[PDB]
Design a binder for this molecule. Structure first.
Ligand code: MG
Ligand code: ZN
Lengths: 56, 147, 170, 101, 14, 94, 1112, 221, 55
DNA sequence: GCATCCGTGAGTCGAGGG
DNA sequence: TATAATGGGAGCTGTCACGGATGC
RNA sequence: CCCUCGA
C-alpha cells in the first residue's frame, strides 16, 4: 500500500530518473487523484471509531 | 537532531565547525612581527609562514584555537559584519583605532552598502558571461575580419 | 520595508499547478500598477498615463478592459510568496500568479509543509520582482517546481501530505 | 514639542517628491518639449526665455528683444503668436490637458 | 559616581 | 516547471550562469524590440488574448526558448561590450 | 424548543457576581457611599492619612474628602471623547503652631475616574479595563540557598515600592549578614542599634549550637546604641556626614517609618502567622521614647537559626504557592498611584510653605492639585495594567475584567520569567483556571479567575468547599485560602451521594493537592462543582473532559474573538453557563420588578411595575464598540406581556433569548472534500450566505479637524477645487456626506480645503498656466476620503464647532467632524471560523448548494470539516457535540451537558434512536423503500464492521445512525460516499480575523523622514518589511538582483525608485540601482560619533557617495 | 480500515501515542516539579477524564507550552549566530586541489564495548550521500573512482560492502579540509542537496548551512 | 569610480572642523512666531544648507 | 589561581490600541 | 538691585551566560 | 516604544 515513505521515495526516484519537470507533473497528478479518492473514500471520525480494546 | 527525527547533512555542521576553528594563537613569534599570545586567522599565519620559509627565516609556531560561534563571528576581518552582528560599540572602537578596511568579501557588508552580493548571480564566476546571437556574432566577426 | 509588496490571508488552492498561486485581482492591480498603466496606454483604454492613474484611483471608475490588460501584464511573470517566520530559503518561493476573485491568496498544497503553512488563518506577503534579472532569478532559481528537494537533507520536500496520502493509501 | 521616540514611524516625508510626482514632472517637461518642437526655433526659444525653461528665470521683453535683436513689442507679439499656435495644437491633440490637475 | 554629592562635598571643604 | 528547465541546467556549468544568460538575452530582446530574435515565426511564444493569439510579451520566456534552440552563443570575453552594443544598434535600430 | 439537561450533581451555590473583583474593589477604594466619619483607613482615605499632616504656615492637616457628581454621563463622555469622572474635594486646615491661627477650607484636587456599572472605565472617550496583578505576597520567607546546601536565606518583603527587600544569610565565615539595597553588613550591628544586649541575645538564640557564636562580636557590644547607629549610617552612606539626627532619620525611614516602609495587612498577617508573633504596626521596628524598638528582626533570625539547625516546626516556603502569591486589584493599584500623586502634592505644599507671605496663607494657596491629577491620568492612560477594553462580544469584556497578569509596574519582566512563574501550581485548583492562558510568550503570565473563585480582603484567591461531618455533606460552604485548604482532606464533587450522605466506601480526595483514596469517615470537605476548577470561557466548552487541554485552551480563548451575528443563536449543546454569562455581562435587559409591559419599540420598552410607576428603558441601537462590532439591543417582549422579576426585556448583542449566542448552529459533515479542507481549511454552503448565517454589522469611525494655520485657516466646505458634481454629489451644503449615502474607496466623507504652502511655480507650471490661462487657486483639496478597501453606508455625522455652545477644542483647531460608516459583512473566503473545542480554520471554498453532500431526503449540509484535524489534536468534544446535534436536529430540541457531568454515550444513543425513528419512519410512511445507493453503502459498512450482517436495511441504517453516521450523496455525481459519514449539528463561531480587514497591497507610497524607507502599517499604506531572515532567504537562493532590488530600488534609493517607476511607465527596463539613503544616514551618524567612514576604490583613493554636496 | 488506524498507518495523521490517548489510557503525568505522579489517568478521551485527571494533566500541558515559547527565541538567536559566522562562505572555485580529506566511519563502538557494529543507515547517508571520493574505493567488484560524487545507490553499495566486511570507512572531501579561501570549492562540498547533482559555483553554502541547522530548532525537545 | 572598500578610523579635531560648514553657537532651534531657523542655531540655514530648493 | 561585580545579549512578520 | 537667608533626595528588587577586571 | 492579539 502506498503511504508517506513509499510516495516520498517515488518522488525522489522520479526526480533522479525523469527530471524535475516530469517530477512536478507527477506531484500534481498524485495531488489530484489523492484528493479525489480521499473525498469518496468514506473517511470520517465517529466516537465509535476510537475502539477501546477489551484487553485494556 | 537524530533524536528528534531530523535528517540533516553533516557538511552543514562541518561548515559551521570550520568557522569555529578559524583562528590560532601564537606560541612563538619566530622572526615575524607577531607576539606571543596574539590571535589571528589560520590562513594568515599559514601565508606568513610560507613567506618566512620562502625567505629562509624561522616560521611562526602556532596553536589551533577553538572559539564559539559568537566569538568567531565577532572576530571576523570585516568590521561591518561584526558591528552589525552585536557589541557594536566594541567592534567600532577597535576598528576605528586600527583604521580597519572592509574589503566587502562577505554578504552582510554588501547588503549594508546595498550592493550586489558576491554569491549566485552576483558571483564573479558567472556574472561576466556574454550572450550573442549568431547573426550579430558573424557581423562582428566580419568587422574584425576587415581590419 | 519595501515597495511593490502586499499581504493577505492564505487559502488552499487544490486546483493550482505546482508553479501557480492565486492572487486577488485588487492586490495584483495595485502591485503591478505601473505596468498596468503602461499597458492601458499601449491599448485604447487611456490617452496617457496620468488619465489612467486617475481612472484607477476611484473604484467605481474601474471598467472591465483594465482586468484583461492586467492579465496581459502578468503573463509569464512570477511573484514571490513569503510566510513568516522564514526559517530556511523555502520560506520564500516563486509562483506564476492566477488572478482570482475574492481577497485571499491561494496557496498550492504541496508547498505548505515547506512554508510550515496551514489554513487556521496564516497570512502571507507578496513581492514583485521588477527587473528582467530579478524575474529570471525568480523563475529559474526560486520557482516552486524547481525546488523539490530539501537542501538540508536531500529528501523530497514537496511531496504528498496527509490528505493526498489518505486517498492513495485508501 | 514632543519626542519622535514616543512615533516617527508614522510620520511621512512630505518634502521629497514621490516617484509618481517625479515621473509626472518628467513626462511634463518631455511633453512641453514635444509641443514646443511644433513651433519655430525662435518662437519656442522666446517662450522658453519668457517662462524660464532655459536659465531658470524669466527675462523681460527688453532682454529677450535685445537678445534676438528686436523691439519689445515685436518680441511680445512673437510670444503671443507662439502661445496661440500652442493653444491651437493643444486644442487639436488634447495632450497637455491632464497635467493641469 | 553622583555629581551633586561630589559638588556638595567640595562645597563643604570651604 | 519552466519548459525544458533540465536541459537548460545541463547546458551550463553553474545554474547562475544560466540565469545571467537568460536575463541578458531578455534585456537584449526588450531593447531591440524583439527584432534580433532567432525564433522563426512558427516558434514564436504566444499568448491568448480576448481577440486571438498574439506574441508573448515576456522577454524571459523568449530568452529561454531561444536558448533551447541552440542558436545562441554564451560565454565570457566573446566580444568587446561597446562593439556588441554598436553592432546590435546597427543591425536592429532601437 | 425543549431543552433537556443532564447531570446528577446539584450545585449548592450559584456563581458569584463575576465582575465583583472590579466593582467591589473600586467601591472599597473610593468609599463614595460611606459618610466621611464612618470611612475606614483603607483606600484613598489611607493615602490622605499617609500624606497628611504636612509640617515645617507650619502645619496643614487633612480633615475629610468628598466626591461630587460626574460633570457628564457615560454616553456623553464617550461622545465628546471625555473621561467619566467625579470631582474630588478635600477639606484641609492650616494651623500656625505659634500663632494658634486656624484657617480651614475645602480645596479642589481635580477628578477621579468612576468605574461604570459593568466594571470598566471611560478614559478620553475610550472604554478601558484595569487588569488585576499577581505578585509575591509581602511577609517573611525562608528559601534554600542554591549555592550552599543546608543553609537558608531569610527574606523580608514589604509591598511594592513600600521599602526594600531585606535578606538574612549565614556567611561561610559564620557571621550572620543582612543585605538591603545591595549592601552586606553584619546583622549584629543593627541588633545593637535596636537596643539588644549580648545577654538577651545569648539567652534567646543560645539554644542553637555553633550559630549564635557567629552573632557574638565584642566590638559591637562595646558601644552604646548611638555609636552603633552612627556606625551603621557610615556603612550605608559613604561620604555623607554621619550626623546624629541625620542617621536617626535615615534608619527610621528605612525601617520604622510607616509613611515609607509598609508591610501589607497581608504582609503583617503572614509575618505574624509564620514567626508566631504579634505586630503592633506594619513596620519592622518602632521609634518609641527616643529609641528604636524591635518588632520583626529577632523572631526572623530565631526562625532562621531554627530552620538551619533542623529543629522541628520550621520549614522552607513555596513562593509560587497561592498562599504566598496575592492579587492587587484595580482599587489597590489606583490607590498606589494616588499615594504617589499625593506625595508629589505634599512636596509642592512644603515648597509653597517655604516661599511666600508667612502670615497670609490659605489651603488654596498651598495646594497645587496638578501633580495628583497627572499621576491618576498616567495610571488610567499609560499604565501597563490599564488596557484597551475588549468589547468584541460581551464575554470578551467579562473575561477581560477577570484577567490576572504577572507583569506590570512592580511585576515580573518577561524573559526573566522562567518555568516556575508560568507553571500551574497545585494550589491553582479552584482559584486560577489551568487552561485559559495565551499561546506564546505570555503563556502562564496572563491567567483567568476561576468561576467560583473569590479574592479576599488581603488579596488572596479563595475557593468554596462543602462541610462534611461524619460522611454527611452539609449545605454550609466555606471559602478557603490555599493555606487553609492544605489542612483538610477534600473529596471530589462527583462523589456518590444518597441524600446528604456519601454512598461509596472508597472516596477520591485531595490532601495538599495529592490525590488519595479515602474513607467517608476521613472526608472533611467536598468540592462544590467541577465548574470551580475552570474559568468562565473554559466552562463554556461542552464535553471538555473529552478534549486535550491545548485545544481546550484554543476554543476557550477564541470564544472571546467571536463576532456578534445579526442572526446569532445559542448553541444546541450548552454547558448551562450561557444565561449567567449574558446576565453578569450586562449585555441584555431584565425586569427590575414584576409588572406589565406598557410600550414596545425598536427604541424603548416602557414597563408598568407593581408599584404603579412607569419606567422607560431605552435600547442602545447600533452603537460602535471598541473593536468595531455592533452593539444593539433588540426588544424581546410584546405590549401587554406580564413579566416577573428577572425576566428578559431585551436581548443584548450576541445573545438569543438571554442565552449566550457567539455563533451559528450549522449542519456539518466530517469528510475530506477534493482538497478544499486540506490542512484545517473549511468548505461552506452558499446557503449560509442566502439566509445570512455568519453575517455581521461593523461600524468604523472617521475623523477630521479644521485648524487655524499661519497661511490661513482650514475650513470644511462643499467648494472643493478641480472637482466635478459627480464627486460632490452626496455632500450636503456644508461639505459633510449625507446620512444614508453609500461610500466607496476614494469617495469624500468630509470636504476640506487648506491654503497652499508658499509656492515658487516651476517653469513648466508657469508655461502650462499661461497656455490654459487659469489662475492657480489659493487653496487645495485636503478632504477626508474613504481609505482603500473600506466603505459602506453613512449612519452618523457629528460636528463640533468653535464659537458654539458647549464646544471648546484644542488650541488652534476651528472644528472637528466625525463620520460613522456601517457595513454589513457576509461570510467570505478568508474569514476565520472556529468551534469551542479548538478546531479553527479559514473558509477556503464556498460551494453552490448543488455541489454540497446531501442526505437522501435532499437536505444539503452547511460546512464540510476534514477529519484529519481530529486525531492529532485529540479534541473529541466536537465529535460528541456533532452526534448529539444530529439527535437534536431530528428531535427539534437542545441540550445542556455540564462539564464532567454531561450526557454520556448511552443517553446520546437513546436520543439518536429516537431521532432515527423521525428520520426514517417518516420516509417509510411516505411510500419509499431503501435506495440502491444506500444498499451499496450498507455493503461497504458491513465490510467495515459497522453493521451486523443479516439484519434488514433499516436495522443496519439505524446501527449506523446510532454511531452518528448517515448515508451521504455527492451532489455533483449522485453516487454516494462509499462509506457512511458522520453528520450532525455543530456550534461554529465567526472569529474577528476577517480577510476584509487584512488584505493590503502597495506599489509606491509614503516614505519615512530619516530613513526614506516605506512606512509601515496598512492605514498608512505601508510596504511589507523584508527583514534579516528574508534577506537570508534571497541570499540562499543566490538571487542577487532580486535582493538588491529589495535593498535599493524598492525601499530607500530615492534616485533608484524614481527612475524605476518612470522606466516602468515608459515601458523600459529598470535602471542600475544607486546607493541606499539610510547608508548615507549611517555615514553621517558615524561622523557625529567622531568616526571617519571612507568609501574607497581599489587604489585606496576616496570615493564621495554624497556627490560633492557634503564637501566644502 | 478503521479511520484512526488508516490515518496513522498511512502517515496522513496521528502517531501511536495520540491513538493510545484516544482509545487506550491517557497514561502517566508529571508533577510541576518534573516528578511523575504515581497514579495515571486510566481514562481515555473517548471515555472522558475526571476533573482531577484533567487538572493533573494541565501541569504537563502548560509546561510544554512554556517550553515551546521559551524555545523559539533561543532557536532564533542560534540561527542568527550561525548566519553571522557562515555568511561569507560561498562556493568560489571548482577545486582548491587539496590532498586532505576526512574518513566517515561506517561502524561505531558498541556501548557494551563488546565490538564495533554497523552505524544506522540514515546517519551513514547523512555523512556520505552527495559527497566526493578523495581516493579510489574498490568493493564488491565495483570501482568508485577518485573524484566521484557518491549517489544514493553508491551509499547503499558502500553499506553492502561494510556488511560484507570489505570497507570500514569512506574517504571523502569535506568543507573541514577545503583549502579554498573565504569559502568552499565544488569538490569539497559535493552535491547541491536540492538538485541531487554537483553544487553550482556561486551557491551561498554558509547561509544554506545556517538555515538547515536552524529551521528544526523549534522541534528539539 | 566603483567602491571597493570601506575604511573607518579616528577623526582629528581638524578633520571634524573640515567637515563642518559652521559652528553652532546657540542652543536655539526655530523662532516661536516665524517657525524659521534661528541664526547660529542647530537648524540654521547658514550652516546646514537651504530649506527650499535653490532659494 | 579562584570568587565577584559590570555590560550585553535573549525569533519574525502582522494587526490594533492608545 | 539690600532684614537675613549657606551640603539633595529618591529610592525599588523572581534571569542567565560570557568576558573582563578586581580582590583573597 | 508598551500592551494586547494573530501567524
Ligand atoms: Mg497556522
Ligand atoms: Zn576544497
Amino acid at each position: 500500500p502506498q503511504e508517506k515513505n513509499s510516495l516520498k521515495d517515488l518522488v525522489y526516484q522520479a526526480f533522479l530518473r525523469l527530471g524535475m519537470e516530469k517530477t512536478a507533473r507527477l506531484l500534481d497528478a498524485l495531488k489530484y487523484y489523492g484528493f479525489t479518492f480521499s473525498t469518496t473514500s468514506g473517511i470520517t471520525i465517529g466516537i465509535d471509531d476510537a475502539v477501546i480494546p477489551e484487553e485494556k | 537532531y537524530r533524536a528528534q527525527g531530523v535528517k540533516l547533512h553533516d557538511k552543514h555542521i562541518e561548515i559551521v565547525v570550520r568557522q569555529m576553528m578559524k583562528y590560532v594563537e601564537v606560541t612563538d613569534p619566530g622572526d615575524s612581527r607577531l607576539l606571543e599570545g596574539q590571535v589571528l586567522e589560520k590562513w594568515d599565519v599559514e601565508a606568513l609562514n610560507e613567506r618566512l620559509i620562502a625567505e629562509g627565516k624561522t616560521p611562526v609556531a602556532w596553536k589551533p584555537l577553538l572559539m564559539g560561534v559568537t566569538k568567531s563571528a565577532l572576530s571576523t576581518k570585516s568590521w561591518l559584519s561584526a558591528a552589525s552582528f552585536q557589541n557594536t560599540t566594541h567592534v567600532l572602537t577597535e576598528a576605528a583605532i586600527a583604521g580597519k578596511k572592509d574589503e566587502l568579501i562577505g554578504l552582510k557588508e554588501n547588503v549594508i552598502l546595498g550592493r550586489l552580493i558576491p554569491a549566485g548571480t552576483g558571483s564573479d564566476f558567472v556574472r561576466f558571461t556574454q550572450v550573442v546571437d549568431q547573426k550579430t556574432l558573424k557581423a562582428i566577426e566580419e568587422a574584425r575580419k576587415e581590419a | 520595508r519595501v515597495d511593490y509588496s502586499g499581504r493577505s490571508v492564505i487559502v488552499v488552492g487544490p486546483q493550482l499547478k505546482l508553479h501557480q498561486c492565486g492572487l486577488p485581482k485588487r492586490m495584483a492591480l495595485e502591485l503591478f500598477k505601473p505596468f498596468l498603466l503602461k499597458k492601458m496606454e499601449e491599448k485604447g483604454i487611456a490617452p496617457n498615463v496620468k488619465a489612467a492613474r486617475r481612472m484607477l484611483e476611484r473604484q467605481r471608475d474601474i471598467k472591465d478592459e483594465v482586468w484583461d490588460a492586467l492579465e496581459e501584464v502578468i503573463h509569464g511573470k512570477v511573484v514571490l510568496l513569503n510566510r513568516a517566520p522564514t526559517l530556511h530559503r523555502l520560506g520564500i518561493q516563486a509562483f506564476q500568479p492566477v488572478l482570482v476573485e475574492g481577497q485571499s491568496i491561494q496557496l498550492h498544497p504541496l508547498v505548505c509543509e515547506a512554508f510550515n503553512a496551514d489554513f487556521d488563518g496564516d497570512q502571507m506577503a507578496v513581492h514583485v520582482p521588477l527587473s528582467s534579472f530579478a524575474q529570471a532569478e525568480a523563475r529559474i532559481q526560486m520557482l516552486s517546481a524547481h525546488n523539490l528537494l530539501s537542501p538540508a537533507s536531500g529528501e523530497p520536500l514537496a511531496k504528498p501530505s496527509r490528505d493526498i496520502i489518505l486517498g492513495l493509501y485508501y | 514639542p514632543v519626542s519622535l521616540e514616543t512615533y516617527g514611524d508614522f510620520i511621512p516625508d512630505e518634502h521629497l517628491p514621490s516617484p509618481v510626482d517625479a515621473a509626472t514632472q518628467s513626462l511634463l517637461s518631455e511633453e512641453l518639449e514635444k509641443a514646443l518642437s511644433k513651433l519655430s526655433e525662435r518662437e519656442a526659444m522666446v517662450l522658453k526665455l519668457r517662462k524660464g525653461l532655459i536659465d531658470g528665470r524669466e527675462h523681460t521683453l527688453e532682454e529677450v528683444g535685445a537678445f534676438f535683436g528686436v523691439t519689445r513689442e515685436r518680441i511680445r507679439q512673437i510670444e503671443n503668436k507662439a502661445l496661440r499656435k500652442l493653444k491651437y495644437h493643444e486644442s487639436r491633440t488634447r495632450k497637455l490637458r491632464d497635467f493641469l490637475d | 559616581s553622583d555629581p551633586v554629592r561630589q559638588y556638595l562635598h567640595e562645597i563643604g571643604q570651604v | 516547471a519552466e519548459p525544458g528547465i533540465d536541459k537548460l541546467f545541463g547546458m551550463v556549468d553553474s545554474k547562475y550562469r544560466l540565469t545571467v544568460v537568460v536575463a541578458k538575452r531578455a534585456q537584449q530582446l526588450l531593447r531591440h524590440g524583439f527584432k534580433n530574435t532567432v525564433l522563426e515565426p512558427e516558434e514564436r511564444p504566444k499568448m491568448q488574448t480576448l481577440e486571438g493569439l498574439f506574441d508573448d510579451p515576456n522577454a524571459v520566456t523568449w530568452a529561454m526558448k531561444e536558448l533551447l534552440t541552440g542558436r545562441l552563443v554564451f560565454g565570457e570575453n566573446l566580444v568587446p561590450e561597446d562593439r556588441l552594443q554598436k553592432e546590435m544598434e546597427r543591425l536592429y535600430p532601437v | 424548543m425543549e431543552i433537556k439537561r443532564f447531570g446528577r450533581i446539584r450545585e449548592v451555590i450559584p456563581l458569584p457576581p463575576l465582575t465583583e473583583i472590579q466593582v467591589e474593589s473600586y467601591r472599597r477604594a473610593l468609599q463614595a457611599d460611606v459618610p466621611p466619619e464612618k470611612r475606614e483607613n483603607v483606600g484613598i482615605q489611607a493615602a490622605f492619612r499617609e500624606t497628611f499632616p504636612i509640617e515645617e504656615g507650619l502645619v496643614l492637616d487633612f480633615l475629610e474628602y468628598r466626591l461630587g457628581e460626574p460633570p457628564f454621563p457615560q454616553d456623553e463622555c464617550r461622545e465628546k471623547d471625555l473621561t467619566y469622572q467625579a470631582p474630588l474635594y478635600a477639606r484641609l486646615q492650616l494651623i500656625h503652631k505659634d500663632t494658634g491661627l486656624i484657617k480651614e477650607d475645602e480645596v479642589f484636587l481635580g477628578h477621579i475616574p468612576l468605574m461604570t456599572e459593568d466594571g470598566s472605565f471611560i478614559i478620553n472617550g475610550a472604554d478601558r479595563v484595569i487588569v488585576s496583578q499577581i505578585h509575591r505576597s509581602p511577609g517573611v520567607y525562608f528559601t534554600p540557598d542554591p549555592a550552599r546546601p543546608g543553609r537558608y536565606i531569610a527574606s523580608i518583603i514589604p509591598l511594592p515600592k513600600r521599602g526594600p527587600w531585606i535578606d538574612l544569610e549565614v556567611e561561610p565565615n559564620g557571621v550572620v549578614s543582612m543585605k538591603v539595597n545591595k549592601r552586606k553588613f553584619p546583622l549584629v550591628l543593627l541588633l545593637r542599634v535596636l537596643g539588644y544586649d549580648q545577654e538577651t541575645l545569648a539567652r534567646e538564640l543560645g539554644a542553637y549550637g555553633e550559630l549564635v557564636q557567629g552573632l557574638m562580636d565584642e566590638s559591637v557590644f562595646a558601644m552604646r546604641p548611638e555609636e552603633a547607629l552612627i556606625r551603621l549610617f557610615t556603612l550605608l552612606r559613604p561620604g555623607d556626614p554621619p550626623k546624629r539626627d541625620k542617621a536617626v532619620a535615615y534608619v527610621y525611614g528605612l525601617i520604622a517609618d510607616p509613611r515609607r516602609y509598609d508591610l501589607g495587612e497581608a504582609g503583617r498577617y503572614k509575618a505574624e502567622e509564620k514567626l508566631g508573633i504579634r505586630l503592633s504596626g506594619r513596620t519592622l521596628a518602632r521609634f518609641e521614647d527616643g529609641e528604636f524598638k524591635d518588632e520583626v528582626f529577632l523572631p526572623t533570625l530565631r526562625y532562621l537559626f531554627a530552620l538551619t539547625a533542623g529543629v522541628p516546626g520550621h520549614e522552607v516556603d513555596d513562593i509560587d504557592h497561592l498562599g504566598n502569591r496575592r492579587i492587587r486589584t484595580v482599587g489597590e493599584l489606583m490607590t498606589d498611584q494616588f499615594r504617589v500623586g499625593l506625595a508629589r502634592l505634599a512636596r509642592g505644599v512644603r515648597e509653597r510653605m517655604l516661599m511666600g507671605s508667612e502670615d497670609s496663607l490659605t489651603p488654596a494657596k498651598l495646594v497645587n492639585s496638578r501633580p495628583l491629577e497627572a499621576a491618576i491620568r498616567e495610571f488610567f492612560s499609560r499604565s501597563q495594567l490599564s488596557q484597551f477594553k475588549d468589547e468584541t462580544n460581551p464575554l470578551s469584556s467579562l473575561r477581560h475584567k477577570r484577567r490576572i497578569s504577572a507583569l506590570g509596574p512592580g511585576g515580573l519582566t518577561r524573559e526573566r520569567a522562567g518555568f516556575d512563574v508560568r507553571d500551574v501550581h497545585r494550589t491553582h485548583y479552584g482559584r486560577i483556571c489551568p487552561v485559559e492562558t495565551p499561546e506564546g510568550a505570555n503563556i502562564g503570565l496572563i491567567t483567568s479567575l476561576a468561576a467560583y473563585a473569590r479574592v479576599d480582603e488581603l488579596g488572596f484567591i479563595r475557593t468554596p468547599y462543602r462541610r462534611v461531618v461524619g460522611g454527611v455533606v452539609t449545605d454550609e460552604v466555606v471559602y478557603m485560602t490555599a493555606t487553609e485548604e492544605d489542612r483538610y482532606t477534600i473529596a471530589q464533587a462527583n462523589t456518590p451521594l444518597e441524600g446528604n450522605r456519601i454512598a461509596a466506601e472508597r472516596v477520591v480526595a485531595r490532601r495538599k493537592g495529592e490525590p488519595v483514596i479515602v474513607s467517608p469517615e476521613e472526608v472533611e470537605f467536598m468540592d462544590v462543582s467541577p465548574k470551580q476548577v475552570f474559568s468562565v470561557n473554559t466552562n463554556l466548552i461542552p464535553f471538555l473532559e473529552h478534549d486535550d487541554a491545548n485545544r481546550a485552551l484554543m476554543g476557550s480563548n477564541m470564544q472571546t474573538q467571536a463576532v456578534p451575528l445579526i442572526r446569532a443563536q445559542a448553541p444546541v449543546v450548552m454547558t448551562g453557563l450561557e444565561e449567567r454569562v449574558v446576565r453578569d455581562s450586562l449585555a441584555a435587559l431584565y425586569a427590575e420588578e414584576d409588572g406589565e409591559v406598557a410600550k414596545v419599540d425598536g427604541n424603548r420598552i416602557v414597563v408598568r411595575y407593581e408599584d404603579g410607576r412607569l419606567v422607560e428603558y431605552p435600547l442602545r441601537r447600533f452603537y460602535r464598540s471598541n473593536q468595531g462590532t455592533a452593539l444593539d439591543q433588540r426588544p424581546r417582549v410584546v405590549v401587554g406581556q406580564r413579566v416577573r422579576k428577572g425576566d428578559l426585556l431585551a436581548d443584548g448583542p450576541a445573545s438569543e433569548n438571554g442565552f449566550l449566542a457567539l455563533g451559528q448552529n450549522v449542519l456539518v459533515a466530517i469528510m475530506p472534500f477534493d482538497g478544499y479542507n486540506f490542512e484545517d481549511a473549511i468548505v461552506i454552503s452558499e446557503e449560509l450566505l442566502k439566509r445570512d448565517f455568519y453575517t455581521s454589522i461593523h461600524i468604523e469611525r472617521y475623523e477630521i479637524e479644521a485648524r487655524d494655520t499661519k497661511l490661513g485657516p482650514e475650513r470644511i466646505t462643499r467648494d472643493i477645487p478641480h472637482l466635478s458634481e459627480a464627486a460632490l454629489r452626496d455632500l450636503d451644503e456644508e461639505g459633510v456626506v449625507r446620512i444614508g449615502a453609500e461610500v466607496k474607496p476614494g469617495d469624500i466623507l468630509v470636504g476640506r480645503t487648506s491654503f497652499k504652502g508658499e509656492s515658487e511655480p516651476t517653469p513648466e507650471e508657469r508655461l502650462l498656466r499661461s497656455i490654459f490661462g487659469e489662475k492657480a487657486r489659493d487653496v487645495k483639496d485636503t478632504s477626508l476620503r474613504v481609505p482603500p478597501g473600506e466603505g459602506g453606508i453613512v449612519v452618523r455625522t457629528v460636528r463640533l464647532r468653535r464659537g458654539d455652545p458647549g464646544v471648546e477644542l484644542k488650541p488652534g483647531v476651528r472644528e472637528v467632524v466625525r463620520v460613522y460608516v456601517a457595513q454589513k459583512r457576509k461570510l467570505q473566503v478568508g474569514d476565520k471560523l472556529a468551534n469551542r473545542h479548538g478546531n479553527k480554520g479559514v473558509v477556503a471554498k464556498i460551494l453552490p448548494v448543488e455541489d454540497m453532500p446531501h442526505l437522501p431526503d435532499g437536505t444539503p449540509v452547511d460546512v464540510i470539516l476534514n477529519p484529519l484535524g481530529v486525531p492529532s489534536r485529540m479534541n473529541l468534544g466536537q465529535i460528541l457535540e456533532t452526534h448529539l446535534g444530529l439527535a437534536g436536529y431530528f428531535l427539534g430540541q437542545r441540550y445542556i451537558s455540564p462539564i464532567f457531568d454531561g450526557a454520556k454515550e448511552p443517553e446520546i444513543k437513546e436520543l439518536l434512536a429516537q431521532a432515527f425513528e423521525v428520520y426514517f419512519g417518516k420516509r417509510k410512511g411516505e411510500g419509499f423503500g431503501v435506495d440502491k445507493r444506500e444498499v451499496e453503502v450498507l455493503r461497504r459498512a458491513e465490510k467495515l464492521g459497522l453493521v451486523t450482517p443479516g439484519k434488514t436495511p433499516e436495522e443496519q441504517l439505524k446501527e449506523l445512525f446510532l454511531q452518528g453516521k448517515v448515508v451521504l450523496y455527492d451532489g455533483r455525481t449522485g453516487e454516494p460516499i462509499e462509506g457512511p459519514i458522520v453528520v450532525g449539528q455543530m456550534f461554529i463561531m465567526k472569529l474577528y480575523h476577517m480577510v476584509e480587514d487584512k488584505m493590503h497591497a502597495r506599489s509606491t507610497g509614503p516614505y519615512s523622514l530619516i530613513t526614506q524607507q516605506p512606512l509601515g502599517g496598512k492605514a498608512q499604506f505601508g510596504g511589507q518589511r523584508f527583514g534579516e531572515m528574508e534577506v537570508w532567504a534571497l541570499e540562499a537562493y543566490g538571487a542577487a538582483h532580486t535582493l538588491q532590488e529589495m535593498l535599493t530600488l524598492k525601499s530607500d534609493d530615492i534616485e533608484g525608485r524614481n527612475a524605476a517607476y518612470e522606466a516602468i511607465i515608459k515601458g523600459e527596463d529598470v535602471p542600475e540601482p544607486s546607493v541606499p539613503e539610510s547608508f548615507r544616514v549611517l555615514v553621517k551618524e558615524l561622523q557625529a560619533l567622531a568616526l571617519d567612514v571612507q568609501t574607497l576604490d581599489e587604489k585606496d583613493n576616496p570615493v564621495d557617495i554624497f556627490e560633492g554636496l557634503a564637501s566644502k | 480500515f478503521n479511520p484512526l488506524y488508516v490515518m496513522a498507518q498511512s502517515g496522513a495523521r496521528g502517531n501511536p501515542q495520540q491513538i493510545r490517548q484516544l482509545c487506550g489510557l491517557r497514561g502517566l503525568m508529571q508533577k510541576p516539579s518534573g516528578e511523575t505522579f504515581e497514579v495515571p489517568v486510566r481514562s481515555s478521551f473517548r471515555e472522558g477524564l475526571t476533573v482531577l485527571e484533567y487538572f493533573i494533566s494541565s501541569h504537563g500541558a502548560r509546561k510544554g507550552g512554556a517550553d515551546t515559547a521559551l524555545r523559539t527565541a533561543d532557536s532564533g538567536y542560534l540561527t542568527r549566530k550561525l548566519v553571522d559566522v557562515t555568511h561569507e562562505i560561498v562556493v568560489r572555485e571548482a577545486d582548491c586541489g587539496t590532498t586532505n580529506y576526512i574518513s566517515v566511519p561506517l561502524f561505531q563502538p558498541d556501548e557494551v564495548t563488546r565490538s564495533l557494529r554497523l552505524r544506522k543507515r540514515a546517519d551513514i547517508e547523512a555523512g556520505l550521500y552527495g559527497r566526493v571520493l578523495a581516493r579510489e574505493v574498490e568493493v564488491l567488484g565495483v570501482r568508485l573512482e577518485e573524484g566521484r560524487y557518491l549517489s544514493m545507490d553508491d551509499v547503499h553499495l558502500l553499506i553492502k560492502a561494510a556488511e560484507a566486511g570489505e570497507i570500514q570507512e569512506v574517504p571523502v572531501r569535506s568543507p573541514l579540509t577545503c583549502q579554498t579561501r573565504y569559502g568552499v570549492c565544488q569538490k569539497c562540498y559535493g552535491y547541491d542537496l536540492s538538485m541531487a547533482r554537483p553544487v553550482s559555483i556561486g551557491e551561498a553554502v554558509g547561509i544554506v548551512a545556517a538555515q538547515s541547522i536552524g529551521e528544526p530548532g523549534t522541534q528539539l525537545t | 569610480k566603483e567602491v571597493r572598500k570601506v575604511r573607518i578610523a579616528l577623526a582629528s579635531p581638524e578633520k571634524i572642523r573640515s567637515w563642518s560648514y559652521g559652528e553652532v553657537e546657540k542652543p536655539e532651534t526655530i523662532n516661536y512666531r516665524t517657525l524659521k531657523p534661528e541664526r547660529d542655531g542647530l537648524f540654521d540655514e547658514r550652516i546646514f544648507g537651504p530649506i527650499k530648493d535653490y532659494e
